[PDB]
Amino acid sequence: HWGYGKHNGPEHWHKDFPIAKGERQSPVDIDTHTAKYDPSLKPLSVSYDQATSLRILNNGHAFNVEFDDSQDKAVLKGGPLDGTYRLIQFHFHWGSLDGQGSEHTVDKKKYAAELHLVHWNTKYGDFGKAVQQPDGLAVLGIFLKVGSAKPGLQKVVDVLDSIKTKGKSADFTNFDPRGLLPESLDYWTYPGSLTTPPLLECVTWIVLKEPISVSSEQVLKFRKLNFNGEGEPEELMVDNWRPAQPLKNRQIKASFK
Ligand SMILES: [Hg+2]
Ligand SMILES: [Hg+2]
Ligand SMILES: [Zn+2]
């Protein structure tokens, strides 16, 4: 099965998932001097006031916090998007050291971790149909840097011990994702893909310029998770990020000058 190890890592994915060498693969390096300001880009609209978190799960490659998406409770609109996108789950990518971990990079700079809030286009009825369309998904990317602790993140940090191994899940209600947003919503945007198999190219990426800060202690706890299932040799869940891919025929736009 695909993974992040030497024998099943990102460099091996193409064998099982040919799209890995596609034309709109993510992540990519964001070259700030090549990104173009776009005056026509609307401000991002994030309505997470009625969000309903349901559970937290270790899927063997990261941990997802899942939300109820049977209604427009938590939606993303505006920006380069056309229509309403419902939040379905968020997860992170992190490294074994503070100097690496994010998937996207800015002028080649790597961050300690990267948060991805996944949304699907409501006009397609459900997530499953959404990943069969070029504009089916919208992912909001937020960089994490090691510095001061992020209060709103501690709730996630404390429940990790209960989902240490692959397959474990735990009730995780009443979590407010608004506590994970930076102050500014300026962003870069480009058409891309999910960063893990099946690597589907249905994503409009929105990567925020402002990173949020997390404490060393908070990031350390992410690193105590396991890729393995209970009762198996322990493999720490670290460096679950994909290397930057070629931009090819794509332009990265900025919402700010
Ligand atoms: Hg997995
Ligand atoms: Hg697609
Ligand atoms: Zn991700």
Which ligand has its closest atom nearest to the C-alpha of 240? Answer: 3
Rounded CA separation 205/159 (Å): 29
Rounded CA separation 116/26 (Å): 13
Which residues fall within 8 angstroms of residue 92, CB to CB, at 6 or more apart? 62, 63, 113, 114, 115, 116, 144, 222
Q: Are strands 137-146 and 203-208 parallel, antiparallel or unpaired?
A: parallel
Please state, as a whole number, how many other Cβ atoms lie within 10 Å of the Cβ of residue 196. Answer: 22
Q: Is residue 161 within 8 Å of residue 226, measured between CB atoms?
A: no
Sign of the Cα torsion 156, 157, 161, 165 reads: positive
**CA angle, 128 then 26 then 113, to 5°:** 100
Which residues fall within 8 angstroms of residue 124, CB to CB, at 6 or more apart? 130, 132, 133, 136
**Residue with token string 């026509």:** 40
Q: How far is CA 183 from CA 37, 110, 210, in A?
A: 20, 21, 8
Rounded to the nearest angstrom, the distance between the alpha carbon of 82 and the centre of ligand 1 is: 31
Please state, as a whole number, how many other Cβ atoms lie within 10 Å of the Cβ of residue 177. Answer: 19
DSSP the chain: ---SSTTTSTTTHHHH-GGGGSSS-S--EE-TTT-EE-TTPPPEEEE-TT--EEEEEE-SSSEEEEE--SSSSSEEEETT--S-EEEEEEEEEE-SSTT---SSEETTB--SEEEEEEEEEGGGSSHHHHTTSTTSEEEEEEEEEESS--GGGHHHHHHGGGG-SBT-EEE--S--GGGG--S---EEEEEE--SSTT--S-EEEEEESSPEEE-HHHHHHHTT-BSSBTTS---B-----PPP----S---EES--
Query: Do you find a cis peptide bond into 18, omega within 30 degrees of 0?
Result: no
Of 252, 202, 234, whose CA–CA distance to 85 is shortest? 202
Of 85, 59, 246, 49, whose CA–CA distance to 168 is shortest? 59
Rounded CA separation 103/142 (Å): 10
Rounded to the nearest angstrom, the distance between the alpha carbon of 130 and the centre of ligand 2 is: 8
Query: Do you find a cis peptide bond into 198, omega within 30 degrees of 0?
Result: yes
AA identity, residue 171: D
- Radius of gyration in angstroms for the set of CA atoms belonging to the chain, rounded to a whole number: 17
Domain housing 209 = 1-257
Rounded to the nearest angstrom, the distance between the alpha carbon of 248 and the centre of ligand 1 is: 28
Which residues fall within 8 angstroms of residue 212, CB to CB, at 6 or more apart? 115, 142, 143, 144, 145, 150, 180, 181, 182
Resolution in A: 2.0
Q: Is 189 annotated as a binding residue?
A: no
DSSP 24-79: S-S--EE-TTT-EE-TTPPPEEEE-TT--EEEEEE-SSSEEEEE--SSSSSEEEET
> Does the active-site annotation cover 61?
yes
CATH code of the domain covering residue 252: 3.10.200.10
Rounded to the nearest angstrom, the distance between the alpha carbon of 25 and the centre of ligand 1 is: 19
Q: Is 12 annotated as a binding residue?
A: no
Rounded to the nearest angstrom, the distance between the alpha carbon of 91 and the centre of ligand 1 is: 12
Token duo for residue 37: 């300001």
Q: Is 93 annotated as a binding residue?
A: yes
AA identity, residue 127: F
Which ligand has its closest atom nearest to the C-alpha of 57? Answer: 1
Token duo for residue 125: 């009825």
Rounded CA separation 30/188 (Å): 8
What total of structural domains would you count in the chain?
Answer: 1
CA atoms in the 13 A half-sphere facing the CB of 108: 0
Rounded CA separation 188/32 (Å): 9
Q: Is residue 215 within 8 Å of residue 147, measured between CB atoms?
A: yes
Active-site choice (1, 12, 14, 61): 61
AA identity, residue 115: L
